[PDB]
Every structure is written in structure tokens, then in C-alpha cells.
UniProtKB/Swiss-Prot annotation, chains A, B:
Domain UBA-like: 3-40
Assembly information from the UniProt record: Interacts with the cullin CDC53. Interacts with ubiquitin via its UBA-like domain. Interacts with RUB1/NEDD8.
Transmembrane region(s): none
Protein name as annotated: Defective in cullin neddylation protein 1
Length: 250, 250
């Protein structure tokens, strides 16, 4: 389709949002020549201030790959900011930017609007923002729980309902560090990892992921489990089995 | 099915979580008589502390209607706490409790676990919690935006993609009060409501709802719109049409 082709060309040549491509084409009777000419005439500079500061759109465009802000852009981006893909602060960023899955490319409007709302246009600003979120992860339990539950949804592969146990263990190790709001005994954590490996549990469901945070806040030590745990409560089976194995191990 | 019937009876008689009903039945060879007897023997009180303080499960059970914590329970509940269904603080509560839709009943484990995580077991505790969230709505822009976007998803009727304009106007009037982090001119807000009514716009889409927050943060006054607004930017059509009507109205 000739009109579809024109939008795609315009978007490639200018690196603009596709909605903006349709607007320039509509204003120029869908003739790409006149649309480019209209558009550039506008860039030079009775035009209007851009929606977004030039510094900000430049960041986005710097990391875009083939018209897409895709997982590679993101890794490159977080790189520049001073983090790793598997950092907890990166979950906070991804949550901030509205990622639903790390594989889906990030919309240009989602990037620009997010940073603009936070008053950021430079790498250096973006850095201060993320640092402030990382403080909130250490200090606000509601925000900590949002991110903890979010992490599962982001780890979760296309067309799967559970995560692999190695990735869940990798994240548990980050989330249950005592600088974060859910403090628990290290022996209990180590016992949990050993149990999952002994039992050869290969996947973790969303129920288990969520209930484990509640279980550790309720029973933060092995002695509190042995002492107080109610096997007729509403805990998942795997938590009951963990209890039986702790009680067997004394 | 006899086993399904037994779970349902047990759940009715005890007001316990259905997972707990299956556990007591499994421990008593699926004979409801022995299961009740096991269960009550346990309540009296070498039992274990309950998972949740008695004060907390009592709150839930006080508001439950016919085994369900349904919209009527919720209205009754928020009533007791000192709010109205249409309060912004109630969106914060609903978000806290994990409502996805106000019509779906709230799971017993979702109620108990939420309050327990927040260190609350009494009405009075719950009150202090909500007050603290309401402070966060006034002071934290990221939390304000989460709740603003959440509100649309909660207003959104079963099997519909857009909200009615009257409900969106009702919420805009609450969200764009100057005590909240997005400050804008009252004349502009009034012009927006008048435009939507003049144009006879009957529904608001999720795109429009979300972009309006960004539009008001970018152009908080009518003079800033007239002066700076770029009709070739990525704004929704209805925002472009609003601009044309503002420029016509001078």
C-alpha cells in the first residue's frame, strides 16, 4: 500500500515518531517530497518550541537500532547510566519506562514522556533519577513489593506462566539482602535455595513467587518456622514441603 | 461432585480460605465431620499462632457478604475508614489491595496479606496507612502518575476499552486540583471540560487519558498552548482539535 510505504519511508529518513510521519504526510497530500520539505523547514530554528528538549530526543536516537529501541538499545543505555542488566536499579528503570516485557521494543513516546515527566533531559539527570528510585527501593515497602512482583512479570518468557528456578534464585539473592525492607536470617535463605535444588524444582509460579515474600516477612528465621508455622494455613504446597524438610533437618 | 461439595460446605461453615478447606479435608480423608472437628480443636487456644492476628481476620469477616468480599463489602469498609467510593484515597487503597476491577470480589488472602505487610491489624492502623498514602499522592509524582493511570483501568467497565466522558471529567476534577503534583491553570481545565461537552465526546480512550496528563504538564496555561503548541507533534487528534478551538476562541 503506497500510503503505508510513505509513512515507513518518512519515519526512516527522519527518525520521527510514526504519528508525526502521518501528520506531515496528511498536511502535504501524502506526497513524501513535500512532507520532508515541510518537516525540515520546521526543524531549522516562526516555528514552535519542540515538545521535548533537544538533549532528550538525542539520547533516544543515539541508542536506537534500526528504528527500534530494542533490548540492545536498552543494554547499551543502562551501560551508559552505570548499571548492569541484572541490577535491581534496572528493574526500577524498566518499571519507570513502562516495560511490560524486556523483549518488546520501547515506544519513542514512552521514553520521551517518562523522562520529561521526571524533569530529566540529560544522561546526568537520568542518573540522579535512578539513584533516587534506588533509595525508594531501600526505604519504601510498598514500592519494594511492587518491584518484587514486577520482576517476575519481566523475567517471564514469551508464552510461559512460570520462571526457571535459576533466574528466580538469582533475583531472590538480590531482593533478600538485608539493606532492603524485608530482613530475614541468612541461614533460612540458604536453606531455601538448598531445598529447591535438592527437590529438583525447575520452575516457580507467580503464586509461589508472591507468597514467598509474605512467608519470609512472617517467619524470618528457621527457629520461628519450626516453632510457629501452621501447615493448615493457606500456604502453597512447596512452602509446606519446605517446612517438613526443615523439621526433618534437626 | 462430592469432594467439591465438601470443600464448599466447609468454607461456608467456617468462613475459612478455600485452600484451608482443602487442607483440613485432606488431613481427614475428605470427611467433613472429622475435618470440622480437626479445625475447631485447632481454633481453641499445642496449636500454632495464627498466620494473621485475630483482629485482622475479624475485620475481613465483618464485611464479607455471603462468603464474598464484594463491592458492597468494600463500600461498607471504606465507609468505616472514613472515605467515599469516589475519593482519590480510595483509589490508593484499591491499588494497595490489588484490585484489578472493582466488580471482581477481593480474595481473602489479598486482603489479609496486604494489611499484614503494612503492619496493620486494626481499623485505626488501616486509617493511618491510608493517610500516609494520601500524603504520597500529594508529594510523589511517580506515585501520582501510577494512580492516575490506574484510575482509568478501575473505572473501565467489563468488556469495554474506553470510559464515559462524565466519569473521566469527575476524576480529572479530582486529579488536577493544585495540591497534587501536576499544577495547571483553572481556566485551561474549564476550557477542556467545555470543549469535550461542546464536541459531544462520549468516551475517552486509554491513549487520551494518558496523554492529557502529559499535555497539562507541558502546557499548563491557555497562553502557553496558543504560544508554543506544535500541531505536528505526536499528540492525539482530540488534543489538536482542542488547540484549534482555543485558537478560534480568541
Amino acid at each position: 500500500s503506497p500510503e503505508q510505504e510513505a509513512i515507513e519511508s518518512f519515519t526512516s529518513l527522519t527518525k520521527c515518531d510514526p504519528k508525526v510521519s502521518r501528520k506531515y504526510l496528511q498536511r502535504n497530500h501524502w506526497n513524501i517530497n513535500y512532507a520532508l520539505n515541510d518537516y525540515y523547514d520546521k526543524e531549522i530554528g516562526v516555528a514552535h518550541p519542540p515538545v521535548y528538549p533537544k538533549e532528550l530526543t538525542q539520547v533516544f536516537e543515539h541508542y536506537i537500532n534500526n528504528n527500534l529501541f530494542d533490548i540492545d538499545s536498552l543494554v547499551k543505555f543502562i551501560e551508559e547510566l552505570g548499571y548492569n542488566l541484572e541490577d535491581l536499579a534496572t528493574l526500577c528503570l524498566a518499571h519507570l519506562l513502562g516495560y511490560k516485557k524486556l523483549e518488546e521494543p520501547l515506544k519513542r513516546e514512552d521514553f520521551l514522556s517518562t523522562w520529561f515527566m521526571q524533569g530529566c533531559s540529560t544522561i546526568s539527570d537520568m542518573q540522579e533519577c535512578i539513584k533516587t528510585l534506588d533509595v525508594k527501593l531501600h526505604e519504601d515497602l510498598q514500592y519494594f513489593t511492587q518491584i518484587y512482583n514486577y520482576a517476575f512479570n519481566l523475567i517471564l518468557d514469551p508464552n510461559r506462566k512460570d520462571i526457571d528456578t535459576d533466574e528466580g534464585i538469582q533475583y531472590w539473592k538480590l531482593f533478600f539482602q538485608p539493606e532492603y525492607p524485608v530482613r530475614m536470617e541468612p541461614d533460612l535463605l540458604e536453606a531455601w535455595f538448598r531445598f529447591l535444588r535438592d527437590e529438583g524444582k525447575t520452575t516457580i509460579s507467580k503464586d509461589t513467587w508472591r507468597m514467598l515474600l509474605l512467608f519470609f516477612k512472617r517467619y524470618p528465621t528457621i527457629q520461628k518456622i519450626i516453632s510457629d508455622y501452621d501447615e493448615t494455613a493457606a500456604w502453597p504446597f512447596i512452602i509446606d514441603e519446605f517446612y517438613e524438610c526443615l523439621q526433618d533437618q534437626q
